[PDB]
Every structure is written in C-alpha cells, then in structure tokens.
Amino acid sequence: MVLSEGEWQLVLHVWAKVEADVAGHGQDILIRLFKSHPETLEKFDRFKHLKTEAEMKASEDLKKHGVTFLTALGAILKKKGHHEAELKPLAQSHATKHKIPIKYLEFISEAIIHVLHSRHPGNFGADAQGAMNKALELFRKDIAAKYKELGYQG
Ligand code: HEM
C-alpha cells in the first residue's frame, strides 16, 4: 500500500500536536491498551504488578516507556513510507526478544486512534482518522512481512 502526500500531511498535522506532549500521550495510550486488553500487560514483566489505573498513572516507569515507544513510532511516521531501516531493529526485538503477536500491534493501533480522537477532535475528523489508520495498517503490514522473514510471523 501507498499513502498519498495529502494523507501523510493529515497524519503529520495531528502528530505535530502529539509532540507538544509526548509523555502525556504515551501514558494515555499505554493505559488505554492495558485497560481494554489486560492480556497485553503480561508482556511487560516490569509492569505486570500494576493493578489499578492509578497505579499506572503514578508509575514513572510506564511514562518513560510511553515516551520511548511514541518517539520510535514518530520516527517511522515521518519517513512517510520509507521506513525499512527503522523497521528492522524493531521487528527483530518484538519478534525474537519480546514475542509480540501482530494482534497486539492491532490493539495498540486502536488505542492510538482512540486517544487522538479524544484529545484532538479538531485535527482528527473522518479523513484524518482514515489517513492515520491507513498509515498504521502500512506499518503493521510491513512489520508482519518482516516477522515472517525472521521466522516468527506471530
Ligand atoms: C507502534 C508500536 C510499537 C513501537 C513503535 C514500539 C517500540 C518499542 C521500542 C522502541 C522499544 C525499545 C527497545 C526495543 O526495541 O525492544 C520497545 C520495547 C518493548 N516493547 Fe514495544 N513497540 C511497539 C509495540 C509494542 C507492543 C504492542 C507490545 C506489547 C504488548 C510491545 C512490547 C514491548 C516490550 C515487552 C518491550 C520492552 C520493555 C522494556 O524492557 O522496557 N511493544 N517497544
């Protein structure tokens, strides 16, 4: 798949807002995911002990990871499709070390859309959301193809 320049502009426009508060967004997203799909929290050995949302919100550790994760995704999105180099080290760690099924990548894509929709209604209408979805699908499709070559295809 290929996104048009107009679709990238919509994605990058909302992303500029996300960058005014990387840590706040990273936090909201992770928490959202963990709430609506508790199983995913099991993948994090440093977070499993987090019982309530108040526990998550207060966790300085979940916040730094939300920043590290959003920054890697931001780096990928700005490549506007030309992200193969960035995708490699990433695919290898999630398939081989952390073992994250594609399904979990879908779930987080969902959390991302939910959060942007809450915090940025004005820059996230139907078209902006279509663009963001097409972008994350692209990302997932490439990660999946990559998982396969590394012998996981989880
Ligand atoms: C757009 C999606 C994602 C991006 C851009 C991303 C990015 C990252 C980055 C950059 C790291 C740092 C070092 C490494 O490469 O391992 C990381 C770590 C990790 N990721 Fe992700 N990730 C994504 C999705 C996921 C998902 C859905 C899960 C789990 C349900 C996941 C689980 C983990 C775990 C277990 C670690 C390491 C935790 C730690 O020791 O700090 N990642 N991720």
Q: Provide the domain limits for residue 46.
A: 1-154
Distances (CA, A) of 135 to 7, 10, 22, 76, 110: 9, 11, 19, 10, 13
Write down the residue that tokens 């987090």 correspond to: 50
- Structural domain count, the chain: 1
3-state secondary structure 50-106: CCCHHHHHHCHHHHHHHHHHHHHHHHHHCCCCCCHHHHHHHHHHHHHHCCCCHHHHH
Q: Return d(Cα 69, Cα 51) in angstroms, integer.
A: 22
Task: Compute the distance from residue 69 Cα to the ligand 1 centre, in Å.
Answer: 6
Find the CATH number of the domain harbouring 22: 1.10.490.10
| Closest protein CA for atom 1 of ligand 1 | 73
Experimental method: X-ray
Q: What's the reported resolution, in angstroms, to a tenth? A: 2.7
Task: Compute the distance from residue 125 Cα to the ligand 1 centre, in Å.
Answer: 28
Task: Compute the distance from residue 10 Cα to the ligand 1 centre, in Å.
Answer: 25
Q: Select from 41, 65, 68, 69 the residue to mutate for testing ligand 1; criterion: most ligand atoms less than 8 Å from CB.
A: 69
Q: Return d(Cα 154, Cα 133) in angstroms, integer.
A: 21
Helix axes 5-18, 102-119, angle to 10 degrees: 70
